[PDB]
Design a protein around this ligand. Structure first.
Ligand code: NA
Length: 232
């Protein structure tokens, strides 16, 4: 139906091992993204040692400003965590969409409905969670300290895409790395596709440089907005 076609979900998932240390503020980038309805989620990775570089205040602020979630996890748990966050934030966004439609058709929010009707509406939301298009840009930190986390991250991203493909609705996933090749700020690893290109992840995820999280988020939002226009 129309409301399913209109309720396309747009998310940026940042996977990182510490706060930005070069370039402009990613909190502002996420705030910009969210004005377009994009939700920005952040996974911070627990590494080892004295954790000197692993500061996640910024990660929390990015998720707050981007209307999403922040979780901090060991490498073994990145895959499961990414899947949970993507589904839980998609569910929250769609609940809001349905509530707004209810108000337009009727003056009632889901809270104003009796239990039986609230249950019917939640079934509508579950259906939307399966059937809407999902546009996702995964932004992968490839600063020097990421070197030993990268192999796990490559597998996690592959697994995320595979798990999302189970849904009825279309999947469009793009991947970017930050920082970029040579002196560039980001690298497009793959354009939007229904699958993750594993050879491309292996070739393009090189751990070097600092972390320019701000430009990564801006690039991701740009990709989502360009894709929306292409789909139109
Ligand atoms: Na880092």
């Amino acid at each position: 139906n129309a409301m399913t076609r209109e309720a396309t979900i747009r998310q940026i998932l940042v996977i990182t091992d510490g706060c930005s240390n070069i370039g402009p503020d990613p909190v502002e980038a996420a705030r910009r993204a969210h004005r377009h309805g994009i939700v920005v989620n952040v996974i911070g990775i627990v590494g080892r040692g004295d954790a000197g570089e692993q500061g996640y205040q910024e990660a929390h602020s990015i998720a707050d400003a981007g209307g999403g979630m922040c979780r901090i996890v060991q490498p073994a748990d990145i895959s499961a965590t990414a899947q949970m966050m993507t589904h839980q934030t998609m569910q929250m966004t769609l609940q809001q969409v349905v509530n707004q439609e209810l108000l337009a058709v009727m003056g009632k929010s889901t809270e104003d409905l009796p239990p039986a009707d609230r249950a019917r509406v939640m079934q509508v939301v579950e259906k939307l969670e399966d059937e809407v298009a999902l546009h996702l840009v995964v932004c992968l930190d490839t600063s020097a300290s990421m070197r030993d986390k990268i192999p796990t991250v490559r597998e996690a991203v592959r697994d995320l895409a595979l798990s999302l493909k189970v849904r009825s609705g279309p999947l469009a996933v793009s991947v970017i790395a930050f920082p970029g090749k040579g002196e560039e700020a980001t690298r497009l690893v793959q354009p939007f596709s229904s699958e993750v290109n594993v050879a491309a992840l292996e070739a393009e995820l090189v751990a070097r440089g600092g972390t320019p999280t701000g430009p990564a988020i801006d690039h991701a939002a740009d990709l989502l907005l360009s894709h929306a226009r292409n789909v139109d």
